[PDB]
Write a protein that holds these residues in place. Structure first.
Motif, short mmCIF file in Angstrom:
data_model
loop_
_atom_site.label_atom_id
_atom_site.label_comp_id
_atom_site.label_asym_id
_atom_site.label_seq_id
_atom_site.Cartn_x
_atom_site.Cartn_y
_atom_site.Cartn_z
N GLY A 192 -0.92 -3.92 -2.86
CA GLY A 192 0.09 -3.67 -1.85
C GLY A 192 0.65 -4.96 -1.29
O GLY A 192 1.87 -5.14 -1.21
N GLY A 230 -7.78 16.27 -2.55
CA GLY A 230 -8.62 15.23 -3.08
C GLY A 230 -8.93 14.15 -2.08
O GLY A 230 -9.03 12.97 -2.43
N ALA A 231 -9.11 14.54 -0.82
CA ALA A 231 -9.44 13.60 0.23
C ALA A 231 -10.50 14.25 1.10
O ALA A 231 -11.15 15.21 0.67
CB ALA A 231 -8.18 13.16 1.00
N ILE A 232 -10.68 13.72 2.31
CA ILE A 232 -11.90 13.89 3.10
C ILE A 232 -12.05 15.34 3.50
O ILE A 232 -11.24 15.88 4.26
CB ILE A 232 -11.90 12.99 4.34
N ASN A 247 -8.08 8.35 17.62
CA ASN A 247 -8.61 8.56 16.27
C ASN A 247 -9.69 7.55 15.92
O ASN A 247 -9.76 7.05 14.79
CB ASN A 247 -7.49 8.58 15.23
N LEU A 280 -2.64 12.65 -7.84
CA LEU A 280 -3.00 13.03 -6.48
C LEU A 280 -3.92 12.01 -5.82
O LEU A 280 -3.89 11.85 -4.60
CB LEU A 280 -3.59 14.44 -6.47
N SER A 287 -3.89 10.53 -1.98
CA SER A 287 -4.98 11.07 -1.16
C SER A 287 -5.54 10.06 -0.18
O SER A 287 -6.09 10.45 0.85
CB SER A 287 -6.10 11.59 -2.05
N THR A 288 -5.41 8.77 -0.47
CA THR A 288 -5.82 7.77 0.51
C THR A 288 -4.78 7.63 1.61
O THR A 288 -5.13 7.59 2.80
CB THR A 288 -6.04 6.42 -0.17
N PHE A 308 -2.71 9.83 2.62
CA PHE A 308 -2.55 11.01 3.46
C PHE A 308 -3.46 10.96 4.67
O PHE A 308 -3.07 11.43 5.75
CB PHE A 308 -2.82 12.28 2.67
N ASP A 309 -4.65 10.41 4.53
CA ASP A 309 -5.58 10.31 5.64
C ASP A 309 -5.62 8.92 6.26
O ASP A 309 -6.33 8.72 7.25
CB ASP A 309 -6.97 10.76 5.21
N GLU A 310 -4.88 7.97 5.71
CA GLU A 310 -4.53 6.79 6.48
C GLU A 310 -3.27 6.99 7.30
O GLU A 310 -2.97 6.15 8.16
CB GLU A 310 -4.34 5.58 5.57
N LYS A 336 -2.74 9.60 9.32
CA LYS A 336 -3.08 10.23 10.59
C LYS A 336 -3.52 9.21 11.62
O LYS A 336 -3.23 9.36 12.81
CB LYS A 336 -4.18 11.27 10.38
N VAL A 337 -4.20 8.15 11.19
CA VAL A 337 -4.76 7.17 12.10
C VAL A 337 -3.77 6.05 12.35
O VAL A 337 -3.42 5.76 13.50
CB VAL A 337 -6.09 6.62 11.56
N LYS A 338 -3.30 5.41 11.28
CA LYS A 338 -2.43 4.26 11.43
C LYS A 338 -1.00 4.68 11.73
O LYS A 338 -0.57 5.79 11.44
CB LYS A 338 -2.46 3.40 10.17
N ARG A 386 2.03 0.05 1.36
CA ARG A 386 1.36 0.92 0.41
C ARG A 386 2.29 2.01 -0.11
O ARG A 386 2.23 2.36 -1.29
CB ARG A 386 0.13 1.55 1.04
N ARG A 397 1.36 16.14 0.67
CA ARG A 397 1.06 17.56 0.65
C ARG A 397 1.75 18.28 -0.51
O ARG A 397 1.20 19.25 -1.05
CB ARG A 397 1.50 18.13 2.00
#
Ligand code: ANP
Ligand code: MG
Ligand code: MG
Lengths: 216, 121, 251, 345, 217, 107, 121
Positions: D42, E29-31, E42, G42, G46-47, G49-51, G53-55, G63, G108
């Motif tokens: 990145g 495919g995630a948490i 968070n 996917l 997938s990383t 997608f859940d980065e 929510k926080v950042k 990225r 999604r």
RNA sequence: ACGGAAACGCUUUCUAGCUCGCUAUAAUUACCCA
């Protein structure tokens, strides 16, 4: 003359609060213990009855000589501030607690908060069998504020007990900070902090500039 | 389609239309479908049924779109969830939500499925 | 010390007594039994009952007959000994009249220290709300619990209440929280609460110990059976039976 | 206080890879010194979009060019004179044995699997991975756990019973849970200088060759001491985790007589402490009940890449010589063959 | 008399922990096992219920003579420090285990932390047929510390029950360092250290000179 | 239209003993927040009281600030009050009286 | 462009439009594309997608810049993946992300693609 | 010259107490394609 004093304060939460509403039979996988909520806006709410009753029982541990067996057995320092069903002169005692209605729904929505309650999943584990039993209880989120207000009336039946009462009121808020105020607090909920303590006289003629410095 | 008068009865007669374990006589007439492949699907609609009471329908359309993904995916993994959501027309009940009322009707339908799954076997 | 600290007031009335006195005997025969002697003995029978035998029926019980006579019984007292009084009074009055002459009471519960007109008027409204059920009804405590006596004394007070008491005294796990959650599911009752009740009782069937599990299964297959009966004269009875069982075991 | 703590010490004879799921692709490293540089791609693309060459970069990524030393993102930077390499990730030194071709082929490795790393960035061995190595030694060397652990006539000889070892809450019963009572800790996070990225070398029986594979996982160097803490809260658990010294010897004895025979002994290491097969590249027979999966393991393969007849191809690698562990020439280790010694504290 | 004291500590993680979250709207495919975390920042929280129900049960295997078989069968040294539901005088229980929020977020940002919780991939090897089953479970990272408030009440029932209950609270804290705060535990995930045990009075008058010496036992 | 099923909420509540510490629940039916109710208050300017109408307007109006600052209901020491008047206009019906000298004293 | 009321349907009609084995009549209607090469797609998102929510999105978007090149390179290797990223307009939707609510709609949408590919086959 | 005049269904009251999101689970297998 007859006077009244209003107590603006922000009830800022930490370790978000639970004040229970209905124990009615929930849906099957839904929230089990919901927080009390406003019917119009569906925000969280702190009712004034919780703020009154918890502060009553906290000040009953400080300002009672004899241990009270009941709220009618409370002291004369507390019956004049919280009312008394049995005294002839301390019935309807000098404080009107009001509710609180989630003042910063715009500060919390400026941050990335989706809903103003979280739902924490949780369980109990049996001692024998170690078998789990989950609950889902709802709690108003951590960085909320709440518009708190009291209406302390001065009816000239005290005439010098006014500043004696703020040494009880500020002491009660200082106890509410250290105790929890609402729901499962021994599991660490509630934990309210009181901000912007400000006394204003909304009716009558009374000077509060010697009173805000007591409130600091 | 499900209406306000018959969504519980379809969830009754859809557990009865779901075929059970005919063989393997150890507590027979058990379902091929397991509880935890069904509480996962209810775990979505329960947290939509609790958000539909507060938030407006024009803010929940990101999760309501993903129920259509999760039922499809969980049916694609195991044949028993496929046999569920084809017997109980869940993908044709997800097609019709459009407001809060039918959303909560579907979320109660998904609970009535689980209640009658628990009640039988 | 078990029992809620309330007092009940019952007001009774024999339904359609003037019709049962003037016409009365005109159906059998061909108008050949409609004399003055039949009506005079009928007056002596009804007067004998409501002026002599009500004191027999109120013998052991903790009550007070404020009026009895004609065809009225207005009586205050303890609520166990008011409900027992009226069940006993009607089950003797229908033996006394061979099952003719329905009577129809209104019982109302009241707390202690409440004024007696505010008490008697709300009892009399239940009495007239039980006059118009069909005719023959007891109106327990409220406008909705309005049961025919043959649908009350057999079903509620002897069948269901003793089954509920028999289940809830031969165990220790289930308590009053379970009874309260059954009263809620009985009172609200859409079609959805049939599924929620079927889930609730099946959860608690597999939570009780294996000693008392057929005991719970023969209770949940007995509660779910009348809950989903689709005749409406079996679900309303269960709510009044559970109200009476909670009122019996109040601390 | 039945918390009987132990102290396991783990000496890696063979290269050991664990985890992380992810893997660097063919164009995500830099080999210009004798190290491999794995950047944060990145930050690579961010600092390279200043160079106004991201479309030529996108041309390089779909460039189906031969001569693989010009494909591996080294020649992209040498040709287009990007020379700063101030990017994120890390560097690891070479094995020296990765490219079998002495003709150039240098940095022509293709797809490396990452090692498990904490969010600080330092590698470690997770305790859940070491417990799965303990659990097969406990399962195979206990004869009550090997009989019915099988199909029960359900599907395609499908799966373990998962209920021979008595596990659960078990409503109405007391609480046993033997492997809840075997509590394995994660290791101390060791250093990046222990990683070498051995390749893979599958060595077959009945056709004596060692054809290599395009799968070059970032394994630990051999002879790296790694410490573990194990607490056993049940005396029943304390007996097994004390008797691991006998049980690992018994497992390796029953596994050499089953599988390491039919292979030549020169490629097979000696133990020198108690043997253990830590994951990713030890073969299927170290992860399974090997004396119960003889007609059941190979049934899963009706594909291009089937297990040959039975008791599949051996998994050797090439890491350099240390101490000597290898016993032969040409540096054929066993990829997961580690050792341990335990003592109660 | 009334007093109310406070126990300050730092829950330094050592091979950091999982305390399971709630969302079904996770991913493919995630948490799939989220950690509990604060709904606005968070940041991971240690909820006080998971501290309390680990101390309540670890001390139950030490101070209950008769084995409990149920909560509120505790041996009155635990029933008064935690609270029964059924004893008439031990309904409340004079300890308030507040929640714990991640203090040293800037110290973790001084280290090379990509994100405050790591994700760990953990498949289940089927011991026959060798097939797998990946789970991607989230845990708060290794050198995280958490501010640990603990508030104790001293009413006119503590004739000599004050200093007896502090060979109990610190006993439970040094038993937390031998157990795992929930998660897996048997797979790492739990080891904590309690740093800077600092007792003080937030309300009333009590002398914590004699209390700040057995914190450092 | 704001989205509600009834005009009265049911607030659950309890009472906790000081020694036994055992609760005592309650369901109190409150009217919901921002229900707006009608209000009118006839003041009769009869023949005799003509000089004293305005000193009976500084008392009617001063009795409305008090209802805004006291609770106006039952059990109002625990919330359940805070009733604010709005659009407080004084019109005249059946009379010849000019109220353009009062509607500025109200607002 | 893909929005909330249609992205699951766009994914559904995308998966039906991938070509199949026209030859190889051994369990036909089988895609060229496989489950592994689609979960490799996917796993790119997938990383993020859940980065997401926080950042913040502004501390994250490099990225999202590199992930376009990731989809390009995963497309430029197999013809069954270059086919996929053009049937479903993945590269066209990567350029139009620009916030969080479309990042969590693209990440999604890839989940929707995997769900319908698992559902059919 | 209104069965009418005067009259707050009002005071007091914490939805509370107790309860580990827990239990088992090596990111692993196969070795090959042009
Ligand atoms: N033994 C009796 N013989 C004749 N008349 C009687 C006798 N006892 C009472 N009555 C009168 O019978 C009348 C019945 O009154 P009432 O009960 O109001 O009417 P009713 O026939 O019962 N219809 P209902 O009020 O609906 O039950 C009253 O005037 C009683 O005084
Ligand atoms: Mg009558
Ligand atoms: Mg009558």
């Amino acid at each position: 003359t007859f006077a009244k004093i209003k107590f603006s304060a922000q009830i800022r939460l930490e370790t978000g609060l639970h004040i229970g509403g209905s124990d009615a039979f929930a849906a099957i996988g839904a929230i089990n213990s919901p927080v009390i909520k406003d019917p119009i806006t569906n925000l969280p709410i702190i009712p004034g009855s919780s703020l009154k009753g918890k502060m009553r029982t906290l000040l009953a541990k400080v300002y009672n000589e004899k241990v009270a067996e009941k709220p009618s057995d409370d002291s004369d320092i507390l019956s004049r501030l919280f009312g008394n069903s049995k005294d002839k002169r301390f019935k309807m005692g000098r404080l009107i607690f009001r509710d609180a209605f989630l003042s910063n729904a715009d500060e919390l929505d400026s941050l990335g908060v989706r809903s103003y309650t979280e739902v924490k999943f949780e369980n109990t584990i049996d001692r024998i069998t170690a078998e789990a039993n989950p609950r889902q209880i709802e709690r108003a989120i951590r960085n909320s504020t709440f518009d708190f207000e009291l209406i302390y009336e001065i009816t000239d039946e005290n005439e010098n007990q006014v500043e004696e009462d703020f040494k009880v009121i500020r002491d009660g808020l200082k106890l509410l900070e250290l105790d929890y105020l609402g729901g499962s607090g021994s599991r660490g909920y509630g934990k309210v902090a009181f901000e912007n303590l400000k006394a204003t006289t909304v009716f009558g003629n009374y000077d509060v500039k010697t009173l805000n410095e007591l409130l600091t | 389609i499900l209406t306000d008068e018959n969504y519980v009865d379809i969830a009754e007669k859809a557990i009865l239309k779901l075929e059970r374990n005919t063989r393997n006589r150890k507590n027979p007439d058990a379902f091929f479908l397991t509880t935890s492949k069904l509480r996962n699907l209810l775990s979505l609609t329960s947290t939509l049924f609790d958000e539909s009471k507060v938030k407006e329908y024009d803010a929940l359309l990101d999760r309501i779109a993903y129920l259509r993904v999760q039922f499809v995916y969980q049916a694609g993994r195991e044949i028993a969830v496929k046999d569920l959501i084809e017997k109980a027309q869940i993908l044709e009940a997800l097609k019709e939500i459009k407001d809060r009322e039918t959303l909560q009707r579907f979320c109660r339908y998904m609970e009535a499925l689980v209640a009658y799954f628990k009640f039988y076997g | 010390g078990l029992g809620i600290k309330r007092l009940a007031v019952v007001r009774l009335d024999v339904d359609d007594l003037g019709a049962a006195f003037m016409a009365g005997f005109s159906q059998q025969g061909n108008g050949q039994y409609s004399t003055l002697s039949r009506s005079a003995t009928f007056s002596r029978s009804m007067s004998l009952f409501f002026k002599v035998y009500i004191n027999q029926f109120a013998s052991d019980k903790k009550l007070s007959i404020i009026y009895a006579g004609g065809d009225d019984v207005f009586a205050i007292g303890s609520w166990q000994d008011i409900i027992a009084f009226t069940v006993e009074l009607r089950e003797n009055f229908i033996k006394w009249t061979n099952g003719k002459l329905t009577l129809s009471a209104g019982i109302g519960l009241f707390a202690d220290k409440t004024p007696i007109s505010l008490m008697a008027h709300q009892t009399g409204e239940l009495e007239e709300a039980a006059k118009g059920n069909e005719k023959d009804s007891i109106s327990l405590f409220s406008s909705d619990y309005t049961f025919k006596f043959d649908r009350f004394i057999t079903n509620v007070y002897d069948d269901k209440l003793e089954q509920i008491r028999y289940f809830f005294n031969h165990q220790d796990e289930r308590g009053k929280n379970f009874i309260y959650k059954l009263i809620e599911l009985l009172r609200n009752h859409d079609r959805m609460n049939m599924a929620r009740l079927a889930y609730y009782l099946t959860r608690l069937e597999e939570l009780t110990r294996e000693t008392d599990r057929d005991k719970f299964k023969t209770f949940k297959n007995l509660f779910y059976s009348w809950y989903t009966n689709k005749n409406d004269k079996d679900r309303k009875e269960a709510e009044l039976a559970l109200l009476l069982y909670i009122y019996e075991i109040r601390k | 206080n039945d918390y009987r703590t132990f102290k396991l010490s783990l000496l890696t004879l063979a290269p050991i890879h664990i985890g992380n799921g992810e893997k660097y692709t063919s164009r995500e490293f830099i080999y210009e010194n004798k190290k491999f540089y794995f950047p944060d791609m990145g930050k690579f693309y961010n600092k390279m979009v200043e160079k106004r060459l991201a479309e030529k970069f996108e041309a390089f990524l779909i460039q189906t060019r031969p001569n693989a030393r010009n494909n591996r993102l080294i020649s992209f930077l040498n040709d287009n004179r990007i020379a700063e390499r101030s990017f994120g990730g890390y560097s690891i030194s070479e094995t020296g044995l990765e490219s079998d071709k002495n003709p150039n082929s240098a940095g022509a490795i293709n797809e490396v699997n990452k090692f498990i790393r904490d969010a600080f960035g330092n590698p470690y061995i997770p305790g859940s991975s070491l417990k799965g190595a303990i659990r097969t030694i406990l399962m195979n060397t206990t004869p009550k756990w090997n009989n019915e652990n099988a199909v029960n006539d359900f599907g395609r000889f499908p799966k373990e019973n998962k209920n021979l070892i008595p596990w659960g809450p078990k409503k109405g019963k007391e609480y046993d849970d033997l492997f809840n009572a075997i509590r394995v800790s994660d290791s101390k996070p060791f250093d990046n200088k222990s990683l070498i990225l051995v390749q893979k070398w599958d060595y077959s029986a009945k056709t004596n060759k060692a054809k290599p594979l395009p799968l070059y996982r970032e394994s630990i160097s051999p002879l790296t001491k790694i410490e573990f803490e194990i607490t056993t809260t049940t005396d029943e658990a304390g007996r097994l985790i004390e008797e691991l010294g006998k049980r690992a010897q018994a497992f390796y004895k029953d596994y050499k007589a089953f599988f390491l025979s039919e292979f030549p002994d020169d490629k097979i290491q000696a133990n020198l402490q108690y043997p253990i097969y830590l994951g990713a590249g030890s073969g299927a027979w170290t992860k399974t009940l090997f004396k119960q999966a003889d007609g059941i393991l190979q049934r899963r393969y009706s594909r291009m890449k089937t297990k040959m007849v039975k008791k599949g191809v051996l998994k050797l690698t090439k890491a350099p010589l240390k101490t000597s562990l290898v016993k032969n020439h040409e540096s054929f280790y066993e990829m997961g063959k580690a050792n341990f010694m335990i003592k109660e504290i």
